[PDB]
Design a protein around this ligand. Structure first.
Ligand SMILES: *[C@@H]1O[C@H](CO)[C@@H](O)[C@H](O)[C@H]1NC(C)=O
Lengths: 50, 50
């Protein structure tokens, strides 16, 4: 048994229409950079995130 | 007219399909303007719009 609270997930959709991956936007700061760039892969650099 | 989404309604009248024409489509609460054509994109059975 688990709970649900209001938070943001970045979820991508396959070319067949199904969901293959999602990102918790508040788990660790790398995932927050993934959410602010709206991409699953980030490059090397500085990202002013939050 | 109780404070709930109602479950008893009337049958909403329909229309035959038209291809390649600027029409005012209404697909279950989708008011707008566009043309209608066939598509090769495959859906999943629980989808209805895109
Ligand atoms: C997408 O659906 C088609 C239809 O059969 C299938 O051939 C293809 O392998 C599917 N691709 C993925 C990534 O699920």
């Amino acid at each position: 048994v688990g709970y649900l609270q209001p938070r943001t997930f970045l979820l991508k959709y396959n070319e067949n229409g199904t969901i293959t991956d999602a990102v918790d936007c508040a788990l660790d700061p790398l995932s927050e950079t993934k959410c602010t760039l709206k991409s699953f892969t980030v490059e090397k650099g500085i990202y002013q995130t939050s | 007219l109780l404070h709930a989404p109602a479950t008893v309604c009337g049958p909403k009248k329909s229309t035959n399909l038209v291809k390649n024409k600027c029409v005012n489509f209404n697909f279950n609460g989708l008011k707008g303007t566009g043309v209608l054509t066939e598509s090769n994109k495959k859906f999943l059975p629980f989808q209805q719009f895109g």
